[PDB]
Design a protein around this motif. Structure first.
Motif, PDB file in Angstrom:
ATOM      1  N   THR B 280       7.470   5.924  -3.294  1.00 40.85           N
ATOM      2  CA  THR B 280       8.232   6.888  -2.485  1.00 40.85           C
ATOM      3  C   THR B 280       9.661   6.419  -2.187  1.00 40.85           C
ATOM      4  O   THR B 280      10.573   7.248  -2.219  1.00 40.85           O
ATOM      5  CB  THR B 280       7.517   7.275  -1.185  1.00 40.85           C
ATOM      6  N   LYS B 284      13.060   8.477  -2.888  1.00 40.73           N
ATOM      7  CA  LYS B 284      13.949   8.756  -1.763  1.00 40.73           C
ATOM      8  C   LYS B 284      15.391   8.316  -2.086  1.00 40.73           C
ATOM      9  O   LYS B 284      16.316   9.120  -1.944  1.00 40.73           O
ATOM     10  CB  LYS B 284      13.419   8.059  -0.494  1.00 40.73           C
ATOM     11  N   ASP B 321       7.570  13.098  -0.168  1.00 41.48           N
ATOM     12  CA  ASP B 321       7.519  12.613   1.211  1.00 41.48           C
ATOM     13  C   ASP B 321       8.672  13.312   1.954  1.00 41.48           C
ATOM     14  O   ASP B 321       9.721  13.531   1.342  1.00 41.48           O
ATOM     15  CB  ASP B 321       7.650  11.081   1.229  1.00 41.48           C
TER      16      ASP B 321
END
Lengths: 6, 427
Positions: B280, B284, B321
């Motif tokens: 993640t 990101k 996410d």
């Protein structure tokens, strides 16, 4: 990653 | 040596206070063994016993190399602790004593001095700059002044790279400009080395140096490292990809000319994988990087389009996410703010509306503001084509109108004004 001990 | 195992602090003190170099050596080894145990080594008990000034004096014992090594190792483990524990080492006068040990003929002693200075510099800006004022950079770089890095011991080279990365680390203030210019040619050389750990720490050093004003970024970009950073961006090792993406992400916060260098090096070809990466944090930081490329020129937005990255942005906005989704919302608002009508039209044809609307249900005031601004920019482009009704219907069909309706009765001032404006102007 900052400080390291041996 | 089982004879120096599990000594008490009291016995270490008795040995170190003897007027016998050999008894001092055995007690110092006993201290380093205590300080290198995995379960809560007694760092504060060793400091309180007043042993740091004694270890520092042992560093200067050229005639007894083992006591230099044992005291260097003991002090390295104390300096590896808290800021107060590193301060006690610095207060003992350890910095010039460790710098003098860098030129030691014993490689294991030199390496220990490199390690100790890395821990001291790693504490923060003030100790980093103090290590620099004591002249650590020239003897550190001299240890790497070899025709081929492959001739040096692996552990030794990894320790030198890591210590140099701590001299590049930290802000407020950033490292001295002249220190950065002195280190950079050796850093560029370590960035082309074949060891994964050397590559990771070199990337981390580059990521710290690019984390600042455009002048700091320029220093790095002028050394021609961007193509090597893009190559490392494609590595299989996650400890290499993480700082390489951080450095690239930092460079694109710079000028459009600095961003162009990343694009020219072929960075966008790696983003289909980075924007779908199972880690993640990579997803990101890749989306954050994309947001600062879509904030650039229209021809840079065009290269994002040409590389087929808009469907990847729709993907991340649809499912990721929440923190990655917030970066994607930013990437879209930046794209809609600076793009041509044709580029904004393309974004809608890729399916941006439905995931953009679904994110209005989020309990985050900043993302709501970012999405509402993006919608305004999309409508602004639709106004120039006379397709505002076609967009209004699309927003209505996916339940987007019901979400903007509830945002009229919202706590925040900016949310209330933007949503009420959109409804009275297009619905």
């Amino acid at each position: 990653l900052g400080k390291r001990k041996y | 040596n089982q004879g120096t195992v599990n000594w008490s602090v009291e016995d270490i003190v008795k040995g170190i206070n003897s007027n016998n170099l050999e008894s001092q050596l055995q007690a110092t080894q006993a201290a380093r063994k205590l300080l290198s145990r995995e379960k809560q080594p007694p760092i504060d008990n060793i400091i309180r016993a007043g042993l740091i000034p004694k270890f520092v004096s042992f560093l200067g014992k050229t005639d007894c190399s083992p006591i230099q090594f044992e005291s260097a190792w003991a002090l390295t483990n104390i300096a590896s602790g808290t800021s107060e524990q590193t301060k006690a080492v610095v207060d003992g006068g350890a910095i010039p004593a460790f710098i003098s040990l860098l030129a030691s003929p014993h490689a294991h002693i030199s390496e220990q001095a490199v390690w100790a200075l890395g821990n001291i510099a790693g504490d923060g800006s003030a100790f980093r700059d103090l290590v620099i004022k004591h002249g650590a950079i020239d003897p550190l770089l001299a240890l790497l002044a070899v025709p081929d890095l492959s001739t040096l011991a692996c552990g030794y080279l990894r320790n030198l790279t890591w210590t140099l990365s701590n001299l590049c680390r930290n802000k407020n203030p950033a490292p001295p400009l002249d220190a950065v210019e002195q280190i950079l040619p050796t850093l560029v050389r370590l960035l082309h080395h074949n060891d994964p750990e050397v590559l990771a720490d070199s990337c981390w050093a580059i990521s710290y140096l690019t984390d600042g004003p455009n002048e700091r970024i320029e220093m790095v970009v002028k050394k021609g490292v961007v193509p090597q950073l893009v190559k490392l961006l494609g590595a299989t090792e996650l400890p290499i990809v993480t700082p390489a993406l951080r450095a690239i992400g930092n460079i694109v916060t710079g000028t459009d000319e600095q961003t162009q260098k990343v694009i020219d090096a072929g960075a966008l070809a790696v983003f289909p994988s980075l924007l779908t990466n199972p880690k993640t944090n990579i997803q990101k930081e890749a989306t954050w990087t994309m947001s600062n490329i879509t904030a650039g020129r229209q021809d840079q937005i065009q290269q994002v389009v040409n590389h087929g990255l808009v469907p990847f942005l729709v993907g991340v906005l649809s499912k990721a996410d929440f923190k990655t989704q917030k970066e994607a919302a930013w990437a879209i608002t930046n794209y809609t703010s600076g793009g041509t009508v044709e580029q904004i039209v393309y974004l809608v044809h890729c399916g941006i509306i439905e995931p953009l609307m679904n994110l209005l249900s989020a309990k985050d005031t900043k993302i709501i503001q970012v999405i509402l601004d993006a919608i305004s920019n999309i409508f602004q482009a639709a106004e120039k084509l006379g397709e505002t009704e076609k967009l209004s219907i699309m927003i209505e069909e996916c339940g987007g109108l019901d979400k903007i309706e509830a945002l009229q009765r919202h706590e925040n001032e900016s949310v209330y004004k933007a949503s009420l404006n959109l409804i009275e102007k297009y619905f």
